[PDB]
Design a protein around this ligand. Structure first.
Ligand SMILES: *[C@@H]1O[C@H](CO)[C@@H](O[C@@H]2O[C@H](CO)[C@@H](O[C@@H]3O[C@H](CO)[C@@H](O)[C@H](O[C@H]4O[C@H](CO)[C@@H](O)[C@H](O)[C@@H]4O)[C@@H]3O)[C@H](O)[C@H]2NC(C)=O)[C@H](O)[C@H]1NC(C)=O
Ligand SMILES: *[C@@H]1O[C@H](CO)[C@@H](O[C@@H]2O[C@H](CO)[C@@H](O[C@@H]3O[C@H](CO)[C@@H](O)[C@H](O[C@H]4O[C@H](CO)[C@@H](O)[C@H](O)[C@@H]4O)[C@@H]3O)[C@H](O)[C@H]2NC(C)=O)[C@H](O)[C@H]1NC(C)=O
Ligand SMILES: *[C@@H]1O[C@H](CO)[C@@H](O[C@@H]2O[C@H](CO)[C@@H](O[C@@H]3O[C@H](CO)[C@@H](O)[C@H](O)[C@@H]3O)[C@H](O)[C@H]2NC(C)=O)[C@H](O)[C@H]1NC(C)=O
Ligand SMILES: *[C@@H]1O[C@H](CO)[C@@H](O[C@@H]2O[C@H](CO)[C@@H](O[C@@H]3O[C@H](CO)[C@@H](O)[C@H](O)[C@@H]3O)[C@H](O)[C@H]2NC(C)=O)[C@H](O)[C@H]1NC(C)=O
Ligand SMILES: *[C@@H]1O[C@H](CO)[C@@H](O[C@@H]2O[C@H](CO)[C@@H](O)[C@H](O)[C@H]2NC(C)=O)[C@H](O)[C@H]1NC(C)=O
Ligand SMILES: *[C@@H]1O[C@H](CO)[C@@H](O[C@@H]2O[C@H](CO)[C@@H](O)[C@H](O)[C@H]2NC(C)=O)[C@H](O)[C@H]1NC(C)=O
Ligand SMILES: *[C@@H]1O[C@H](CO)[C@@H](O[C@@H]2O[C@H](CO)[C@@H](O)[C@H](O)[C@H]2NC(C)=O)[C@H](O)[C@H]1NC(C)=O
Ligand SMILES: *[C@@H]1O[C@H](CO)[C@@H](O[C@@H]2O[C@H](CO)[C@@H](O)[C@H](O)[C@H]2NC(C)=O)[C@H](O)[C@H]1NC(C)=O
Ligand SMILES: *[C@@H]1O[C@H](CO)[C@@H](O[C@@H]2O[C@H](CO)[C@@H](O)[C@H](O)[C@H]2NC(C)=O)[C@H](O)[C@H]1NC(C)=O
Ligand SMILES: *[C@@H]1O[C@H](CO)[C@@H](O[C@@H]2O[C@H](CO)[C@@H](O)[C@H](O)[C@H]2NC(C)=O)[C@H](O)[C@H]1NC(C)=O
Ligand SMILES: O=C(O)CC[C@H](NP(=O)(O)OCc1ccc(-c2ccccc2)cc1)C(=O)O
Ligand SMILES: O=C(O)CC[C@H](NP(=O)(O)OCc1ccc(-c2ccccc2)cc1)C(=O)O
Ligand SMILES: *[C@@H]1O[C@H](CO)[C@@H](O)[C@H](O)[C@H]1NC(C)=O
Ligand SMILES: *[C@@H]1O[C@H](CO)[C@@H](O)[C@H](O)[C@H]1NC(C)=O
Ligand SMILES: *[C@@H]1O[C@H](CO)[C@@H](O)[C@H](O)[C@H]1NC(C)=O
Ligand SMILES: *[C@@H]1O[C@H](CO)[C@@H](O)[C@H](O)[C@H]1NC(C)=O
Ligand SMILES: [Ca+2]
Ligand SMILES: [Ca+2]
Ligand SMILES: [Cl-]
Ligand SMILES: [Cl-]
Ligand SMILES: [Zn+2]
Ligand SMILES: [Zn+2]
Ligand SMILES: [Zn+2]
Ligand SMILES: [Zn+2]
Lengths: 694, 694
């Protein structure tokens, strides 16, 4: 029998281990020759594995690299202009790798060049609320200052945006032990903690879903017209550089000026965490100087696109995609994900060689340049947007399988909730103490839903990974699942060795997943979801789950607005239309579900499958959200304060955010009402896609 | 047998005559009670006729009306401020109607209020090239002048836009006998010519596809947030008013200043057609004064939406739509079209009562407020855009059936060319001297194709009618057909009595179509097209016809650019990518056609029907054209100089237009190249929708 169980049983932990080892011996930085050779290897193996067609799709996109002969670093400079302390030029390499070539030194991708010199201001996590606290409560002015910020809590691109708007002339990012050093665990190579010389690489763009900065809207193909750099999307205007906590301590220890406002501003280093500006008395004439010489360069990138043609509905696509480029070795990010994709392809291929085909087409993708701003997935989706629009059933992401090893972490559209619950009830938990129990049981126990007893938490999709173009721009039902450390305490900061040279195969094999059983569990969740989406006669989406969350989100946005009852009275701000739309959606969805349960007729089936497939699509507004034309989903968007976090009714949320500070309340409240109208209309329009069609 | 022939034979000229009489006894101005009662009558009759469901869809949109107690008029005013000549306050009513109430006096809908006073400049047809001739060649400055322009050649909204940009402080539009009085035919009521007191009503908006000025993007429903008037879309900034040629002669006869530059500037009145500014010597102290007091008012409008549910593919929609609102009696425009729709519904209904249903759903629409800017169709399409997007097969328009009585006039997507040729070969010509010949024969003889022997001319879709939102915004294959006077000599000006009180039932019955045989022929063309689109197993679209015109349009735009060979060399402007895309489209379309001819398998069929249906959809760019976000089709758009005319590769055309006048040639030629890239990419993307799907 070829069924989901034959598919799942063919997946092997030992294969995933072998592939991870294979993918992590050398760096695979986007745009480099070694990542192109890995692309060719994956292409060859996916063909061997039995896919019908496997092609490279290449694009020429803006990337960023340090200058090999003019290294980036930061100094403390004295009165005379002598540089009395310099930050490191590279991370000390881990045991046995001290001779590996082509390890990119730590840098912030897309930083402009510059050598600014000035006084430091410490801005905590550089969040919106941290700048509010500084400027409004403490009366500290960041204008013309170098800001130093600890990594964590929010996407680092948002930190840089916030610093820029505060008037900073440069940004220094660092990893604080409070966020990247778990109590009682040893530093790499003897445990999974970040050493004092470890540094987190990463891009600091604010693309808002644009993809390659030079070609928003259109694929960066051979004949593409490119914007000039000055009109590029999302580039920071001030130099930025990341450092580790040994170097951070040298920069922070001299800081003077104002005390930190409270303990949420203090990390774990033995320093006061003074906000500044500048250093204490004796050192008041010393300054901090950055030296950034990185260059932005249009560079070729390669996606691998594998097709397994559907037997019955070849014009319906279920996509399993995850990236292949890494900052250095990519032991976790992304190769722990890519090795899982590889074993999934191998398994689907085994069935195919025995004569099976999925009902719908499955596309498999190895995306390039994810780390430089989701460039590979976004360019390919721009190239193929018409096919994806009209044929795209679902997208399942596949980055890092093991953020941690504590429990499952799922984020997806409501349309996939039932599917995820059902599937995880049929999978075995890999967790210690849950042997012979289901994955659903261990997951629900460790990550309970805040609103329902006996259900697990499932979070919202924002961005920070390759599902973004499919879900936020194109409105294709999307999901992701991975093992994680602890949703409660660390959602957005990364595991300690994130984007560092220390994130290696040995890190994984020794400290995360020696038996590869967590990797296997994640392969079964991702592979099983793809299997059901591609093979179930009726698409495995439950529109009623959308109705339930729409109500929750409406209650939520209404409660936010209700912090301002006088203004709601003055400007006649009513949420009645939105509640009415949500009520209608609930009623129509329930009737559609009855019909779906109550119909031999393939046209009715496919008509109904089309209504299911286009339901996510109905939440797209072709005008996009305000000043974010590539975020088109009206129910969800990446948070404007933290690209990693999903926000619900984003148009209304952003219109209400900090509204008491707006100088023209009439205008501001007018925009809140406009967004309520857009949201009510889009919800009712989506509901009406589920009505009888004629 | 229920086949197209049973459908066609049931249509009767006498029914169309009875319905036209019924629809034209009183005015049916948009937003008035009499047009709401007509909507209710049509709703009732379409139900009687046998439609499954017939509903009113209402919206509250910005309309415009004269002030009943403060009439609009124009004066010549002397030195002292005495008004020595006044234009008429109404058209003398035709025989037997001199007691009919609620005839709206001539006015330009959406004119702002004002009473500007100044010297006249005569600007011919107020076209782009007429303002070029005035400002660049003749050195005449329109700033602070009242412009007087003759109607004709281009949409009157473009005239007003051009006058505004030239700095005019008001616009007077008039009907010149050269354009509205055919030699040797009598004036109404004794023939079909415009009398000296006749005046053409009409809106002067520049909406660019927005629909209701207050709610661009979203339907104007009960809870809609409306822009303030100052942010409304498309309103003119200067007063405008239309007059007849008796009144025009009084304004033109005194004109002085410069002679007309040549004979293409002279109409048929006994006046010099001096450009001005101002009057000749003796009258140099006299001025022209406008008095406009019209008001814009949000008003309810009603579409009638009739559904005939498909037997096999109810989730596939073929739409037959045309408007019902008229300026006054609407003898031709639109009731000669609406009476045809009515008989078509009646005929489809007769078959339905005998047990037949079309394969696909047919929707029938009676649109409101077309005359005020396509408001009814556009609001309804905004409300239903998700259903239309994913289910819309085709839209067939149905305004005026008889612009004239000489030959057929068709404008449609290339996808419908074969269908139109095939159908007209099976219909009888109604034309004198072609008895027993096909409609194809008489049409091809009277309106030959400029590029192919033995084929008829079929023109491009622009705007100026209700297909605009379906085709230019949504990318649904669209077509229209009507009898006309003479494409060669009058494409865009209207028949003489257009939008005047004289356009009555008697006009039609006496002077256009006494036997209603032209109306019947048009009913058979429109009804037959709807029948084939709704019933043919394989959609009746030939993608190869698109490949042929894409090449023609590419050759055309390339030849325009090639007027500037030095700049093409300097800025490396290549059309190679576009020709390559068109070549690929041609190759892929040919292979798809072979497969379409070469496949019992309904999924392959519907997969192939979906590829046919989504082909027009693939030409939509979700970013829209530059500064025209509701014109999204990359191959076609309404001309930026004349909304009535279709333009091909509009993005490139507009980037090249008057490019030798641009002050930064580097920037201008950069934009030409950007548009070439967008066009090549969109053509290749559309081609790829026709490739094998996996
Ligand atoms: C959720 O679904 C329900 C349908 O079950 C849908 O109800 C509709 O609501 C609209 C707006 O409230 C109703 O609109 C009315 O329609 C009648 C004609 O049928 C008009 O006469 C009404 O206008 C008068 O009253 C207004 C309100 O005070 C005045 O402002 C106006 O000037 C007129 O005097 C009004 O337009 C519509 O009939 C129902 N349809 C039904 C019950 O079938 C509701 O809109 C959906 N929610 C959303 C957010 O779409
Ligand atoms: C019409 O359809 C044809 C397919 O039949 C399609 O042809 C494609 O054209 C592109 C662009 O010309 C080809 O791109 C090349 O691909 C190879 C790898 O396969 C690259 O090595 C090439 O890059 C090198 O050469 C460039 C050109 O001088 C250099 O600028 C570059 O730096 C590299 O050195 C190049 O990207 C592609 O292979 C074909 N595909 C085929 C033949 O199958 C054509 O693009 C379609 N037209 C449109 C408008 O889409
Ligand atoms: C997740 O699993 C649940 C539980 O198995 C699935 O719900 C069940 O789905 C079946 C199949 O449609 C339902 O059976 C139907 O029952 C009605 C009678 O009530 C009958 O009319 C139909 O012919 C059919 O037998 C069943 O009621 C339903 N059970 C529930 C809701 O408790 C659910 O569909 C799965 N989710 C997926 C696949 O996305
Ligand atoms: C308009 O009318 C023309 C002429 O009738 C239609 O073209 C014809 O379409 C038929 C049906 O597909 C073609 O027949 C096919 O012939 C091939 C052999 O060459 C065979 O493989 C198929 O099984 C089938 O019999 C026919 O060739 C074709 N004739 C032409 C192009 O001259 C055309 O389809 C009509 N357009 C519409 C309906 O939009
Ligand atoms: C990763 O695995 C691949 C596939 O087995 C290895 O590439 C193969 O290497 C052998 C021996 O050098 C060649 O004969 C094959 O042509 C390669 N197959 C390909 C590229 O598909 C590769 O050596 C492994 N890499 C590492 C670092 O272990
Ligand atoms: C990277 O930095 C190097 C080293 O300083 C740069 O190479 C110098 O470039 C200048 C002109 O731009 C030459 O005159 C020097 O002789 C070069 N010096 C050396 C030591 O090679 C190079 O420009 C930078 N690379 C970039 C910007 O991509
Ligand atoms: C930090 O790095 C800088 C740059 O290499 C060092 O300063 C240079 O020192 C050399 C020789 O000692 C001078 O000839 C250069 O002119 C200096 N360059 C600059 C830009 O100042 C500095 O010594 C290092 N500081 C420490 C404490 O190691
Ligand atoms: C146009 O035709 C309609 C439909 O026959 C006429 O409306 C009907 O009039 C009769 C007699 O007054 C009523 O009993 C019916 O209820 C009406 N039917 C409807 C509204 O569906 C209408 O009178 C005709 N109008 C003109 C101007 O001739
Ligand atoms: C249309 O014009 C009439 C007539 O002049 C306007 O009615 C006058 O309005 C003013 C105040 O706006 C009153 O004080 C006058 O007494 C009215 N005069 C008469 C004769 O009724 C009316 O405002 C206009 N209608 C509009 C603008 O919709
Ligand atoms: C054109 O119309 C105007 C407005 O009705 C006429 O001028 C008015 O004449 C009356 C009485 O004769 C005066 O009391 C008003 O003050 C005038 N109004 C204005 C605005 O001037 C004028 O007579 C008409 N001209 C002709 C030739 O008929
Ligand atoms: O440019 C962009 O939008 C994104 C490009 C890139 N995506 P990535 O680094 O491949 O994945 C982001 C990420 C976010 C949070 C965590 C995490 C891990 C463990 C515990 C808690 C949270 C891990 C990873 C980036 O963000 O730099
Ligand atoms: O606002 C808008 O876009 C359009 C609203 C409205 N559409 P309409 O008047 O109902 O139809 C436009 C029209 C254009 C040309 C001709 C014609 C007739 C006979 C011979 C040659 C040409 C007839 C009609 C209008 O244009 O005012
Ligand atoms: C911050 O400092 C600069 C002066 O260097 C000034 O232009 C800016 O207005 C200041 N902002 C505030 C809020 O004081
Ligand atoms: C993985 O799980 C083990 C054993 O349960 C635990 O000791 C270890 O700390 C975990 N690794 C990480 C990175 O959390
Ligand atoms: C037209 O006239 C006004 C002066 O009343 C002036 O502002 C404008 O620049 C003039 N334009 C030209 C081209 O002379
Ligand atoms: C209609 O056709 C007749 C007879 O052929 C012709 O005399 C008349 O002028 C035509 N009417 C119009 C409006 O062209
Ligand atoms: Ca791009
Ligand atoms: Ca609207
Ligand atoms: Cl993931
Ligand atoms: Cl028409
Ligand atoms: Zn990653
Ligand atoms: Zn990463
Ligand atoms: Zn009309
Ligand atoms: Zn009209």
């Amino acid at each position: 029998k070829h069924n989901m169980k034959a598919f799942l049983d063919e997946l092997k932990a030992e294969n995933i281990k072998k592939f991870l080892y294979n993918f992590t011996q050398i760096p695979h930085l986007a745009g480099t020759e070694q990542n192109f050779q890995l692309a060719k290897q994956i292409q060859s193996q996916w063909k061997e594995f039995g896919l019908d067609s496997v092609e490279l799709a290449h694009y020429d996109v803006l990337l960023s690299y340090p200058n090999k002969t003019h290294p980036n670093y930061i100094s403390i400079i004295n009165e005379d202009g002598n540089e009395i302390f310099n930050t490191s030029l590279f991370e000390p390499p881990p045991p046995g790798y001290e001779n590996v070539s082509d390890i990119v030194p730590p840098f912030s991708a897309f930083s402009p060049q510059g050598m600014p010199e000035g006084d430091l201001v410490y801005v905590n996590y550089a969040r919106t609320e941290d700048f509010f606290k500084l400027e409004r409560d403490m009366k500290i002015n960041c204008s013309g200052k170098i800001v130093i910020a600890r990594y964590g809590k929010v996407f680092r691109g948002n930190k840089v945006k916030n610093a820029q708007l505060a008037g900073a002339k440069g940004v220094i990012l660092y990893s604080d032990p409070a966020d990247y050093f778990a109590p009682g665990v040893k530093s790499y190579p003897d445990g999974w903690n970040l050493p004092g010389g470890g540094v987190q690489r990463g891009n600091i763009l604010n693309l808002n879903g644009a993809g390659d900065p030079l070609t928003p809207g259109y694929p960066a193909n051979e004949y593409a017209y490119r914007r000039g750099i000055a009109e590029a999307v999302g580039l920071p205007s001030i130099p930025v550089h990341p450092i580790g906590y040994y170097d951070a301590q040298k920069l922070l220890e001299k800081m003077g000026g104002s005390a930190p406002p409270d303990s949420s501003w203090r990390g774990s280093l033995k320093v006061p965490y003074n906000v500044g500006p500048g250093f204490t008395g004796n050192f008041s004439t010393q300054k901090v100087k950055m030296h950034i010489h990185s260059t932005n360069e249009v560079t070729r990138i390669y996606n691998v696109i594998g097709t397994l043609r559907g037997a019955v509905e070849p014009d319906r696509y279920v996509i399993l995609g995850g990236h292949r480029d890494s900052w250095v070795f990519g032991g976790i990010d992304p190769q722990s994900g890519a090795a899982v994709v590889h074993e999934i392809v191998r398994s689907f291929g085994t069935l195919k060689k025995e004569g099976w085909r999925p009902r719908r087409t499955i596309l498999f993708a190895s995306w390039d340049a994810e780390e430089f701003g989701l460039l590979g997935s976004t360019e390919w989706a721009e190239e193929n947007s018409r096919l994806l629009q009209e044929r795209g059933v679902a997208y399942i992401n596949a980055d890092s399988s093991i953020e941690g090893n504590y429990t499952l972490r799922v984020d997806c559209t409501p349309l996939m909730y039932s599917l995820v619950h059902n599937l995880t009830k049929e999978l075995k938990s890999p967790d210690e103490g849950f042997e012979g129990k289901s994955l659903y049981e261990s997951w629900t126990k460790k990550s309970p839903s805040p609103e329902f007893s006996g259900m697990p938490r499932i979070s919202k999709l924002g961005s920070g990974n390759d599902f973004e173009v499919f879900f936020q721009r194109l409105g294709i039902a999307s999901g992701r699942a991975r093992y994680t450390k602890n949703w409660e305490t660390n959602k957005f900061s990364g595991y300690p060795l994130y984007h560092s040279v220390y994130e290696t195969y040995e890190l994984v094999e020794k400290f995360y997943d020696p038996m590869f059983k967590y990797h296997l569990t994640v392969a079964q969740v991702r592979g099983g979801m793809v299997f059901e989406l591609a093979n179930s006669i009726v698409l495995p989406f439950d529109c009623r789950d959308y109705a339930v969350v729409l109500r929750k989100y409406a209650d939520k946005i209404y409660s936010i607005s209700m912090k301002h009852p006088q203004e709601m009275k003055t400007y006649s701000v009513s949420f009645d239309s939105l509640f009415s739309a949500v009520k209608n959606f609930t009623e129509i969805a329930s009737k559609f579900s009855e019909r779906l349960q109550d119909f031999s007729n393939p046209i009715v089936l496919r008509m109904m499958n089309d209504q299911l497939m286009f339901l996510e699509r109905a939440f797209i507004d072709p005008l996009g959200l305000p000043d974010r034309p590539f975020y088109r989903h009206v129910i969800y968007a990446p948070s404007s304060h933290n690209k990693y976090a999903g926000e619900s009714f984003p148009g209304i949320y952003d219109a209400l955010f900090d509204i008491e500070s707006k100088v023209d309340p009439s205008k501001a409240w007018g925009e809140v009402k406009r967004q309520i109208y857009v949201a009510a209309f889009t919800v009712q329009a989506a509901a009406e896609t589920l009505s009888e069609v004629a």
